Amino acid sequence: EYGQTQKMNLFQSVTSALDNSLAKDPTAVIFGEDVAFGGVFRCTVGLRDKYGKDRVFNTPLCEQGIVGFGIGIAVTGATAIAEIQFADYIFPAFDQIVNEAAKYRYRSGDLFNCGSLTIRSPWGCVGHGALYHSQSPEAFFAHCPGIKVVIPRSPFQAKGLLLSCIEDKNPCIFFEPKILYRAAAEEVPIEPYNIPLSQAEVIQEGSDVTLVAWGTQVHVIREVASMAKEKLGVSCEVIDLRTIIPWDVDTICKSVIKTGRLLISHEAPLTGGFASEISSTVQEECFLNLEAPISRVCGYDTPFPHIFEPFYIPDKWKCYDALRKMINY
């Protein structure tokens, strides 16, 4: 389908996407903290040697600077691939992302833009990351028209989605689930290929209930589907959202019109979490089809704890129990 493949874990698939990008786009540069020696999660190994120190380089330790600097590169039309070392540390750049990058094209009447910016950042829980190496900030960014927010669930998906982000003519934030960096490998095409943005993927068809998640949590809901089938004889339709904004309203609504039930799950805290936007939209569009209340199985409304992580996360049991109750409603 896509030419020769090799087994790659998620960090390798990121390197491959970045390599493909710099090979085909002579404007493209990669920068951030500690990117030059290959990055703290290895995502840029070999790239400075292959493409040159003027193209893969370290910045000072200043996230607001990293994003402002990336916006400026993109204003000249050059492809700027910025790294933020953990998603938890994207906040100092919030004003540059929200007030500047997201608004740049609109506010200038399209005289200027920063479409050729992509910000990539490790994201989500990692077992022991605690408050500042665990966060999933996508809902903060979801309320900001003018940026795209994209989160893959695997190495094949990561390379295709990241290539799309890099090439998309809008500033994109690409969140890489860091617990998957060295998890299982899968076959990934060596040459470039794209997966469309704003398109959810139905990974398993079903008829009784729709399950929606993104990132690592897709694997959790896949397992929940299996538990529901085996233990309850319930047929689950499993959907990976992939793009947080602009999101694929049509695919989710079509599924819920068919099943009549929806459960959305994410690691991020419940309140103001992106599940609230999906839930309220699906309720508006599929109201007459809803057999039970749409359920949200999310992280608790606390900071992300160190020793308590096993009790914090919306794991397969929490999702399964919510599902069981919804099936019984």
């Binding site: 607001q64 402002g68 506010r107 200038s108």
Partner: protein, 370 residues
């Protein structure tokens, strides 16, 4: 003898704190006195008459437009305005020392750069009125100018955000082998923002061909500089980042021109940032240049009168035209949020269209394009 990677320095065997020199700070570079007289002949740029007249007519035309739009604002004809009074020389002097294609990032005191670059009066007006002629499609507050043709990046309200952006554009210019420099203007208040520290440091470590132009007029809204910083203004910060730095008299168009011209030359040749801090008041740049013209025999009261009349007429003609144009179609509130309009955003646009069909009497649709 010290072996530390973080700094290059000798040992000292006695405890001595380093004291800032604030009472006698970095001196203020001057070329002409308040009577318009050249002080040091070896520093005279000897600009030709046509260029110097252009500096003078750019400044005064800006001042004419300020007067009229400021009155327009007082009447609520436009919703907002910022004047350039006292700024005219720093902007026209520095713009004159740039290449036409050098990229400009700024804030809301930079209209003179556009005026020097022959930005049409009709388009300054179009932006303030948000009318159909505005390429910004009426989306921003007045005085938020931008021009892709004249390499003047659209102004945004959040202070200092353009500083690290300017550095990124300069890095990209370096790679492109542009032989282009970027200039970035900001006030002494804006220099307190974290983004200023980001831009100055990145420009030095990444070796970018950028001029940082700080306008120090002693105040940020109500805040005097005694509450803004305690070092020797902004120029004294440059050397701490490794940035070559100078302070100039912002009322002296020649001192500004000379410093900007030399900063541009070296920034582009060496790929290193330069910082110019221009001192102004918030003894005027226009007066001082007028005195100079009057010495060369290059101006006189008759020419001053005719130009005053001609410039008022040109500004009035643009003003009247701008007020009479319609505003853009309300549809334009939805485009350019992304390059391509997302289906869900198009849905919102269709919902406004349907709404206006039914409730349109309640909207001021009179003067919007249809």
């Amino acid at each position: 003898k010290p072996q530390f990677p973080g700094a290059s320095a000798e040992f000292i065997d006695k405890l001595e704190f380093i004291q800032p020199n604030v009472i006698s700070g970095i001196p203020i570079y001057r070329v002409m006195d308040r009577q318009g007289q050249i002080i040091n002949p070896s520093e005279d740029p000897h600009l030709p008459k046509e260029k110097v007249l252009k500096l003078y007519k750019s400044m005064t035309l800006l001042n004419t437009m300020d007067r009229i739009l400021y009155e327009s604002q007082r009447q609520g004809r436009i919703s907002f305005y910022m004047t350039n009074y006292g700024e005219e020389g720093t902007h026209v002097g520095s713009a004159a020392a740039l290449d036409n294609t050098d990229l400009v990032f700024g804030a809301y005191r930079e209209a003179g750069v556009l005026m020097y670059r022959d930005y049409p009066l009709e388009l300054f007006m179009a932006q303030c009125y948000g009318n159909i002629s505005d390429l910004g499609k009426g989306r921003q507050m007045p005085v938020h100018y931008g021009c892709k043709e004249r390499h003047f990046v659209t102004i945004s309200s959040p202070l200092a955000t353009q500083i690290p952006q300017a550095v990124g554009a300069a890095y990209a210019a370096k790679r492109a082998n542009a032989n282009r420099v970027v200039i970035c203007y900001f006030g002494e208040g804006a220099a307190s923002e974290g983004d200023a520290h980001a831009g100055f440091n990145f420009a030095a470590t990444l070796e970018c061909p950028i001029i940082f132009f700080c306008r120090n007029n002693g105040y940020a809204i109500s805040t005097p500089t005694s509450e803004q910083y305690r070092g020797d203004g902004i120029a004294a910060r440059g050397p701490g980042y490794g940035i070559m730095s100078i302070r100039v008299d912002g009322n002296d168009v020649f001192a500004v021109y000379n410093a900007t011209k030399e900063a541009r030359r070296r920034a582009v040749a060496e790929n290193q940032p330069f910082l110019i801090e221009a001192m102004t008041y918030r003894d005027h740049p226009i007066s001082r240049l007028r005195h100079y013209l009057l010495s060369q025999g290059w101006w006189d009261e008759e020419q001053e009168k005719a130009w005053r009349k001609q410039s008022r007429r040109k500004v009035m003609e643009a003003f009247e035209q701008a007020e009479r144009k319609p505003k853009p179609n309300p549809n334009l509130l939805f485009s350019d949020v992304y390059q391509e309009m997302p289906a869900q955003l198009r849905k919102q646009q269709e919902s406004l269209a349907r709404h206006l069909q039914t409730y349109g009497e309640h909207y001021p649709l009179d003067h919007f394009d249809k």
